[PDB]
Amino acid sequence: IVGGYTCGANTVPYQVSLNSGYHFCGGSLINSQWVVSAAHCYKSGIQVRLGEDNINVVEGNEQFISASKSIVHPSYNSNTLNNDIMLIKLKSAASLNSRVASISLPTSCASAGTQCLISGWGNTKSSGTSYPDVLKCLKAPILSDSSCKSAYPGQITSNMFCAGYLEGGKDSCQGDSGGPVVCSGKLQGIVSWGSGCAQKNKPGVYTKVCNYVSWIKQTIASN
Numbered sequence: 554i555v556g557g558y559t560c561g562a563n564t565v566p567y568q569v570s571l572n573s574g575y576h577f578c579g580g581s582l583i584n585s586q587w588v589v590s591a592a593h594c595y596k597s598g599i600q601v602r603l604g605e606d607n608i609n610v611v612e613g614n615e616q617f618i619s620a621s622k623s624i625v626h627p628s629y630n631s632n633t634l635n636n637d638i639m640l641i642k643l644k645s646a647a648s649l650n651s652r653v654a655s656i657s658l659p660t661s662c663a664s665a666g667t668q669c670l671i672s673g674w675g676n677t678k679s680s681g682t683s684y685p686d687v688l689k690c691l692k693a694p695i696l697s698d699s700s701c702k703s704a705y706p707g708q709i710t711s712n713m714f715c716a717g718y719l720e721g722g723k724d725s726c727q728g729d730s731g732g733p734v735v736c737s738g739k740l741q742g743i744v745s746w747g748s749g750c751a752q753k754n755k756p757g758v759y760t761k762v763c764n765y766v767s768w769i770k771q772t773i774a775s776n
């Protein structure tokens with residue numbers, strides 16, 4: 554997260570860290586047994602880490618649970634990142650408490666202008682590399698589709714939305730992928746892609762979660 558602020562230990566209880574010997578992507582806990590992340594984060598041998606603050610220090614509030622199965626969206630296109638969403642089932646149910654909580658799915662999509670909270674352990678530099686060990690947060694509004702499509706001609710589908718600032722300076726970045734974009738207390742987006750990080754006229758692109766609620770519910774109930 555570039556231009557954000559330190560969230561504070563366990564202030565984003567639904568945030569998860571996907572680990573394969575190291576942190577590689579973020580995710581969101583939707584219930585005690587399921588995690589939603591980005592399809593481009595797919596890997597074999599994923600361990601889900603909950604209750605995390607500093608990813609390099611064990612503070613006693615963590616729960617490390619291996620994934621039993623991963624389900625990438627059936628229409629995921631790796632070339633365009635259309636339908637960049639995947640579901641991960643935990644081998645054992647997570648114990649929900651103050652520091653480990655689930656985030657609710659939307660009843661409707663969020664309108665442009667709505668302020669959201671984006672979080673992650675990704676790169677904090679727009680130019681250069683500096684990975685934080687503590688969770689970073691960023692408040693950002695959902696941008697109009699026009700501004701989004703103008704920034705990325707012919708690359709934005711109805712399953713994506715832009716959020717952030719056209720002037721640059723604040724944005725999600727590499728390492729934040731698969732992470733949560735929560736607006737009005739509901740999971741509205743998943744960190745997907747963009748052009749660089751925090752660059753002028755290049756806002757972040759996120760998977761529009763409100764389009765997948767039916768698929769999510771049917772899939773988790775059948776697996």
Ligand SMILES: CC(=N)N1CCC(Oc2ccc([C@H](Cc3ccc4ccc(C(=N)N)cc4c3)C(=O)O)cc2)CC1
Nearest residue numbers: 632633634708725726727745746747748749750757758
């Ligand atoms: C042809 C087409 N339709 N495209 C091209 C691919 C594009 O997807 C991608 C997929 C991956 C990449 C990465 C770089 C990357 C990865 C994750 C990111 C996550 C967030 C942000 C951001 N600035 N908000 C930027 C990122 C940038 C890389 O360098 O490999 C960049 C664009 C979708 C749009």
Ligand SMILES: [Ca+2]
Nearest residue numbers: 607608610611
């Ligand atoms: Ca830790």
